[PDB]
Symmetry: D2
Subunit: 268 residues, 4 copies
Amino acid sequence: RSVLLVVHTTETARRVEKVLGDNKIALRVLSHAADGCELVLVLGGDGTFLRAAELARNASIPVLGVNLGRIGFLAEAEAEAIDAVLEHVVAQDYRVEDRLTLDVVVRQGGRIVNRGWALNEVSLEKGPRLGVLGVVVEIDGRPVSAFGCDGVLVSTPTGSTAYAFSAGGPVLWPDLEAILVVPNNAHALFGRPMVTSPEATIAIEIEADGHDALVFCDGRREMLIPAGSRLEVTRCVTSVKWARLDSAPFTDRLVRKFRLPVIGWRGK
Amino acid sequence: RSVLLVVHTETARRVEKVLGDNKIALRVLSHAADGCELVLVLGGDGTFLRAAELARNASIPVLGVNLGRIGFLAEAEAEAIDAVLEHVVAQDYRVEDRLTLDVVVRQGGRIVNRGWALNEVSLEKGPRLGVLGVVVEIDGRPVSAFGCDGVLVSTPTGSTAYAFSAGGPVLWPDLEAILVVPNNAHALFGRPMVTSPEATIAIEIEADGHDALVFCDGRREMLIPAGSRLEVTRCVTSVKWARLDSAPFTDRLVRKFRLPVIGWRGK
Amino acid sequence: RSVLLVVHTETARRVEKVLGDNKIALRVLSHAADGCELVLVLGGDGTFLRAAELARNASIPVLGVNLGRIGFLAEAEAEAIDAVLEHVVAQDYRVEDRLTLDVVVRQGGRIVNRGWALNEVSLEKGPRLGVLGVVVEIDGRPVSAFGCDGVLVSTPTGSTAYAFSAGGPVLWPDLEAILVVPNNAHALFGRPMVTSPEATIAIEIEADGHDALVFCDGRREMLIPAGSRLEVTRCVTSVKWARLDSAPFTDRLVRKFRLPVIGWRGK
Amino acid sequence: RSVLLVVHTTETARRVEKVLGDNKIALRVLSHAADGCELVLVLGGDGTFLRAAELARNASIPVLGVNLGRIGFLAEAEAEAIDAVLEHVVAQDYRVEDRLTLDVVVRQGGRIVNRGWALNEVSLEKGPRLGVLGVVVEIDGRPVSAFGCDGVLVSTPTGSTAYAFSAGGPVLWPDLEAILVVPNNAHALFGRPMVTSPEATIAIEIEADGHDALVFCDGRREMLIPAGSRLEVTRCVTSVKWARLDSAPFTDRLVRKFRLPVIGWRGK
């Protein structure tokens, strides 16, 4: 019964990790394959959740988040319930569910030059602080737009709230399976975001007569993209496991975090 | 074997003749025309929609051929008549169900009205002046309250319609989701939300206000009494679509908006 | 000395009493009420507008005091009544002309109608269905043609109004420009343009279509015959505004939308 | 009668420069105070115009552009009139007019740490390819918004078409005098552009508990902005002179460059 605790920097940790021992439940701690475990409890923020998930993916085991600082769409519950959750942690009665996670592939000269993945988003951005990245977006073999820009986002629904949102993207509930593509500061009449199927295949072609570009997956992982190659993203067959439980629905998390006037509502 | 041909109000007499040779009963329109097996149509998306209405009624597939302008609803252009006519007579075309919406109007907890949309449920303000106060709600929880010209509630297919003019995001025809788009809202957060098909969009209309109008697919109108709440969900009864090797959505989009694609490689 | 007090339909009886002591003729409304020197008003921007209508007619300054909600048009709140009343009686407040619009409807080259707006000239589609085909033109040259729910044409002051709901850019009250904002356009390029005050916005309405409506400042309506062209420019006769030490626009904006400003230093 | 010719890389140059000699008109050439001159003829693109202007400003003398490659909003005329323009160049009957140009000032500890200017735009952008730049925007002493972002644009009307546009900004005709402020990928409900007076004073305060940021003026000139300082922009009292002539109005240039459906227009 080994669990892999992960905390941001975060003092209610020892509490949990002690209460976990009392139920003869092994425990490791972190801030790097931490295998063998059963679950991956994480206390912190969404940027923390992501890190923790980067571990669970590998080990092929559930993730579970507990918010500390600010609010996070990725958190399952607050710190005012560390015991309740904990209780479920041991009881192992939380429902696990696979979550749409992306699979990124750079391909040059028809050959796979690199490989990555994203449980949240895939951001392609220009290299030089100056100028614009010439690019071509193509969905399912056919190309939609040819424009210069700061980059292009490709995110899961869960990442629509993140940089996608900032970029101009629309909100998408977490339980929906699709793919968001948001041009980033395009210099074109048409530059609206696009939503596709979980099976669609999104590919972006980096201009060949230009500098290089970078790719950031979930803000953490990076990878240089050599001019004239092509970023192809699709639904990874290997999804991130998530521990679920009676939690605040995404609709409330959105109102909280953004402070949306919900006054006047009656209900059904 | 009967085929109901629906048109706006020329390559038609060619569909009707060729169809006859293969001895096929052909009726014409511009009303539950039952019996038939397919519902061919020559026109625009507007025309297509009326047709689909009838097809919806009969419980039989629809199929169209753009005559004038471009439409994201048609399966083939006007120069592939026989080509299609050939599939029409052969009946080798695919029939895939398409997600349709079930619009319900409830007042005092009683279904005051009912409806269905294939493209969009556009809720609008009645008077040419003022603003409509509304409260959007996703699955039992509200997400906003604001005044606006209304609130669109379309289908991945309707996303290129009014929802798109309302400044919504291009969705893809095969995608199965619901797109909610605030119509000229007076708020900070008035951007489009997209949900699962099991999602339940509800739109509560301000009691202390006027009466509203709900337009389904741009034709079927109905009256919304102040203080009544509009409920939209996945209609269990979908509209059958006749599918055949045609330009994929991506091309229609580019062809339609004149999106530049110069410099594309391929792989 | 006369002052026309205009209200929606309480701190009023206080303005009217205090005003009387200083022996000042006070009439009340909710119609050219001439003679007076100033036009005080207690209400919202809506109320303010009607008032400004009258003030416009008389050729005399307007001045308001928000009673209920917040408004970017008022100069003071309801707890600065005397404070204002004091400036009202003292007549030490500034009077600066505000840019106003001159809406002209021309058909066959003949001024079929005429109008003026202080906040916005919102051109709209008549039927609850369909789309209005229009051709926007800046100073004799066109910039677009598309179908849409209409085309707003506001003032820096109107930018926080409907133009803002149409998704336009926040302009500043003291700025002297014209903001054109396409209303739910079905185009790629349907974003707001802003021009000089000498600019001449003209909006040609599709001949082969229905008739449209033009709403000035949200009250004064008029009918636009298909194929007629709407001309909007700087009205030579501006509406006088009573200016007095008040919260600058920047604060109204933040107060109104609840814009966060935490962490600001100062210099 | 000394003129300072400037060409991008551009073969119709020697032509002009010879025809200019024939009228006893001195001529210098470029691709750095090139003073003493009378006018500054430039053949090329908008990125070229900007460079050329960077010279004229200094010398306090008119600018005039002739497009070569693509189209440019900054160009007065095409190459199919090199003589016509030339003709006016010598005849000196072109009208000169001052153009609203900005004045940028970084100020730390209440002290002016740097100084710049922009005839087109002022782009403040985050440093790290990752994370978001915490910032505070303030117009005329009062602060409007407090958000994280990729930066914030501050441009003249003439620069509304450039990066401002790409950023989300609206179009503004060249002859209008105002100031455009366009948040760049803000993560806030309110992030719409803002238009102010030519006298308004725009200031942006860079968070102190964060990395540094950069500022680019007209895409050329740069300058690092030390955390916790404040970028204040205002209308420079010294404007760029522009040579004017019967040219295509801004309305047409916009339709050309973007290909806008102008069909159905009747006219007055």
